[PDB]
Amino acid sequence: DIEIAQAAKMKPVMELARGLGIQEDEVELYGKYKAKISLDVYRRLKDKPDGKLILVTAITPTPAGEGKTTTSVGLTDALARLGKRVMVCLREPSLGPSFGIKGGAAGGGYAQVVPMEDINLHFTGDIHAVTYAHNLLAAMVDNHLQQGNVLNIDPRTITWRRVIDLNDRALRNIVIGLGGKANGVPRETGFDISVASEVMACLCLASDLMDLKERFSRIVVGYTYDGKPVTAGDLEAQGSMALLMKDAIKPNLVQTLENTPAFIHGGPFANIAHGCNSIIATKTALKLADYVVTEAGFGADLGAEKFYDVKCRYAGFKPDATVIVATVRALKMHGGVPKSDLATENLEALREGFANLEKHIENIGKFGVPAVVAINAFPTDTEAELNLLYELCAKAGAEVALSWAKGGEGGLELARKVLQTLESRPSNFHVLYNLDLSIKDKIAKIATEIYGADGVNYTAEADKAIQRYESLGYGNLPVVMAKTQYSFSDDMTKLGRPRNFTITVREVRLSAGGRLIVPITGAIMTMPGLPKRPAACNIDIDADGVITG
Amino acid sequence: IEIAQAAKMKPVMELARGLGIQEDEVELYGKYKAKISLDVYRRLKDKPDGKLILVTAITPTPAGEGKTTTSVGLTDALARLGKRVMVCLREPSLGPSFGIKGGAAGGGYAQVVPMEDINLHFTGDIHAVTYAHNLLAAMVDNHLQQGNVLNIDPRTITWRRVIDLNDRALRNIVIGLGGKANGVPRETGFDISVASEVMACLCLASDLMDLKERFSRIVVGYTYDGKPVTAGDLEAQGSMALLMKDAIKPNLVQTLENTPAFIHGGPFANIAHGCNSIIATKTALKLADYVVTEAGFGADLGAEKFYDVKCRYAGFKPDATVIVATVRALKMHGGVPKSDLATENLEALREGFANLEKHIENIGKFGVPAVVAINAFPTDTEAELNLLYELCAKAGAEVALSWAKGGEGGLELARKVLQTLESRPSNFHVLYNLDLSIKDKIAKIATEIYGADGVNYTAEADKAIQRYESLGYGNLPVVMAKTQYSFSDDMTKLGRPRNFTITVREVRLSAGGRLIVPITGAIMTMPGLPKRPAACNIDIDADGVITG
Amino acid sequence: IEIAQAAKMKPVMELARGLGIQEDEVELYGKYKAKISLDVYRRLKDKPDGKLILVTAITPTPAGEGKTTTSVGLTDALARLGKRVMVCLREPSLGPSFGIKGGAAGGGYAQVVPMEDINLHFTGDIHAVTYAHNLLAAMVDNHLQQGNVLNIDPRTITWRRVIDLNDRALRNIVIGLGGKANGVPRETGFDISVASEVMACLCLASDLMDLKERFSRIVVGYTYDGKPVTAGDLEAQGSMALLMKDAIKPNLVQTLENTPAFIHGGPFANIAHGCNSIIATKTALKLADYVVTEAGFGADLGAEKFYDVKCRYAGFKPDATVIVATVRALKMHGGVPKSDLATENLEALREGFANLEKHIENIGKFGVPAVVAINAFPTDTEAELNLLYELCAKAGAEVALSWAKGGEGGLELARKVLQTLESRPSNFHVLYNLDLSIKDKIAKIATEIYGADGVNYTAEADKAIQRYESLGYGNLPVVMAKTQYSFSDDMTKLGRPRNFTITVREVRLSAGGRLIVPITGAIMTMPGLPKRPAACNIDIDADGVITG
Prior knowledge:
two-stranded antiparallel ribbon; P-loop_NTPase (chain A); Formate_THF_ligase_CS (chain A); EC 6.3.4.3 (chain A); Rossmann fold; part of a larger assembly; one-carbon metabolism (chain A); Domain 2, N(10)-formyltetrahydrofolate synthetase; 3 chains
């Protein structure tokens, strides 16, 4: 009854690709339950109309839990049960998370996309390419120095760090190229967890390969002893990198416990990147489906925001609705209640917590898309509580989801609301800001309309940095806030709806394979480490089965 | 261009059928590649095995080896006479592809396919390894950060990290910098993945459960008291194993001639036996009458190691064994320059021949047949041939033109291996004993095979050996980590060097197999791209690859 | 050239006589420099002390301070009227000499001599310090190598190494690399020697035995449990002391006007009180009627610190205190550019004046007289002067042209200090208490002296403070480690900045004295030569120096 203990009947993905309209020649199988669909499927369909895009998001996430994917999948399965033609697009998780704090499922309970074990491990080798397409470029840099450094790159300015898909601290700050004039040039760098590599970020925003390629040739690796930028393009590396991602460009097909087809592609950080799965998996999902559920990392002040301002902006998508997830316990948590006494009733801590969800509602409205809250059901939640949460939603259609437990069935109501609102309230989508605005301007719009922050404070580094980019020509790019997700403010302790506060960005990075990434707090946790109790320590694989994952 | 040679492949699932594999025992990675389960072997555990045409080669030279081509091209001929035989090769490190380009699996009309899927990601067998290693490293470094419960000395740590790219800048580095939250600063580096003890364990393991344990014994470092610490004491054994549940399965692909070819594993031939994985062949055996397998470097390194590492543990008995070699190759062994291979010379071709002749002899010593295999080249004229032809006066000697003729040019030799394997019944025996002495095992490997009048051990090579034997890692085999371009450690002594001597400077322990006794600086465990990389030149058309 | 100003010196041994020093209490370092023993003080322990014309200055600016010149030039005048007074300065770091050249001790005809022996090695007082520090570091690093018996965390080690040269490349490094015999790899760096907590201890110690113990309390780092470890737990206390047995003695030299001048010590004025050594003055006192001493930076930093660090422990009571300042200097404080000092402006000269006026006030707060000292410059015309003259409407205000007139231009002011020190009897009191709170001590130093409406402490500044007080290093004084170019942390706010606020980012503990509360990035504990160093240009003739 544990989530993985729920291993049962999948249909061969060819049957699936078939029973969806995908040609057999456009399916690169991996087992009988995995596939890399050609981008031709899309390409030849581009003229038909798009399906309905339903973005699922959630409330300020707290340690109490909410359940985003679980719903995302449940919502799907439900729409399917109600006869609707639909797919789901979700990200392939990072590997390290499996060996440090144990791997989880694509959602959970009866709400999840499978084969679980694969998606949670090597899945179809997507990440590996990213890891290598990345480390190769890293070596072309180190090589170029080692070769006479024609381009004249002042090594101490190299930003292109190296990467690996495991949680390893020590690799955060290391010195490279040691040993003598025959081992490269001495320097300072480190490793970032793969999923956080800009390369992955690009895969999640590219149109196809030739596009993804040009992007690569835009990646900044460092600067000359003169100040001018040097890109991977100058190291002529886009083709090679490109060749490594040749097979990672295609989305991957896999189903739900209930068989509904779904795409698992991309999957980047959601503070240093848009926390969304690739546009290709979705765009291909929009022709092959009449309904498309997809989700975004972190609460709606981030994932949602970037989903709307970066993904959709580039992809030309136009969300029709948007479900937002919230539990009672997490809410009460936002109302001040500790973790321990959460099970105890308290409409009061619940009422002031609502301010949280009630803010996201309002924000999601700041985009022109209709919102529907989903109350992830939980044993302790009382009627005196749920019932309040419902009427409290004096703004958007509410509905409890029992998808975790009852699979598709427990998700029937929500579908009926989503569907209901997918008819009477057509969406009027539109980016929160404009690309031809000041950089600090863009940041305020967000901190001001979304985080509900009074204003923005910046450090001397933060300024020179910005000032550089704008004159260096990247001012008109999209912005990607990298704040703490456990709060509407860059203060992880300020739960609920924090008022009269100010965001302080203290550093500003750049991702020319996309845009400007400004971090507020130490939101630079680009490489997590393992716990004193490495989940990998209680790991073991039977002479047959795998135990403890 | 040998790449242009991309035409007419077949469903592997079918081949898996036309070999006796239940459909439920093949994981497809496209329609032309497929992981085959271990369940096959296990059940056909008792079924009659097959022969073992272990192909090997002379002494590498800037002229042109021919080891692999010849190996598959013979299989393109062998079964091309209605025979039940396969292949068992190795995936070529990735890094080389964007550094010094890439090449087909073997050569000419005998190259296993598809080409690209190989030099590249393939069934991502390396990546699996890569992670099963780095992680270990990650757990070691993490331990320290935790409180170093095992009281390990970060400075004695022998477990480096791993990436599969030619990165020089990564051969010597310092990690852990940054303070109490970044862990413990210390010195390590990166070695190419294929060069991982892990890839090795892979190439020498019965099954996952074997591999799992075969992992636990590998020493990561020692404590302040000098007490060895193993992945075991760390609890990363099974963990690592699960990252490998998919690579432990042998891959499956064909030849241009659709001959069932297994391509599983890829270890460093000098620091390790340099042969393909066991399971692949131990399983390939059952599923066939014959099995054509090759090893790394020359016959003094790869062949010897195949005989004392692989066969040893896995219990094979190399019914046959061939030895490749070309004219121009053996000529150089006579003083013949690289810009002087174009011309004929029946005297240098002669002396140089001593190379081919020395190997021959060594082969026979393992209680297994031998046969000469000759590469065909546009300049190896008549006069030259009729000389080497008769010179091999010692055992079978057939010419093979598989390159430009496919399985055809291999027919001649084909018959020969059958013929000389039908009448010549061998009794395979290890050229040395696992109970001798690390010091004496090197002794008989240096003496009889290379030709060392003696072996010398520097102040280091000594201290270690002792520690190893004082610990217990002394009853293990020995992988001679010396320069491959001569029986002697001297990379300049071509031919059949005499009166020499081999000195062992260092000695690294691999508790995931045997003992690597390094000679000269054969520590190129991490190569490095050139000033004119194929990477800078590789591009993928809005359609397909161009220049890889 | 002020260097050319090298003419007519005298035997120090004689001066030591004409002051009341037994010949057996002077260690000569040439005929014109001499270490005087501590035995002098000790015996004249009860003898009547003297006055303390503590000279200080305005707020530094790219125009020209004048702190030291004025200080000695007043002594060239004071005793130039038959008076028993000396001096007490500091040796200028070596590194600057081959980087941005060197200068005389003070300026004009008031520079202590010989010049060269100072900017250079002198009586090698630094070197002594330099070694007494590095060694400690050497013992710390050695301990680790031994087995880290104290269970110290190499990563928590706060004790860097030390060299007295402007080396950038040495500000962040990793040592210990190389293996079990090279010790434990870790991250540290080098800070200039004069900037050493050691030089400091020196400048604030009763005698060697005091200094010795004053050493033992200095924390080098902590353990894995967070338990402080001190030089004491290391046993380097006395050791270090013996390296210092010779520097603990004050040096002795004269003025161009042979006025007995003590030049002992030289601490960083921002990270430390920036005043000369105690013993020098506590001893200089006895041996005189008066003693003219100065401190580092402005009066908000050096003066305040002199009053709460030095006087505190050593029990002085600054009978007087002067405050230097020039026209052009206070003009800039009115918006006056550097390329705009040449001209007159009685309005900017006015506002800017607020600087001079703010300081004045603060002075009085310590219960000690005050008096304006004005630098004389070729462009500080009549109109300009008569303005600043009367503007100082608050306490004594005399002009001094010591520069081009020697002890002469100091006469005017001379009389004044005597006059206003004869009729104005002060009751010296610390501007804050040692029993308050680190948080509240910063409070009253920020409020009253700088002018902070409040003080803010970042997440770090907080955690530390707490640890310090939770340990005990909380009952100590406070050395404000902030930018010296303004009462405010903002290096751009000239004049008398108001409404501001001071934020403390960091907080470093110096258990060899007090607490350094760093503000902006005032961590320039290791400067760096320019792209056009005086080193590249210094040459010593087959006779004497040229360009230093």
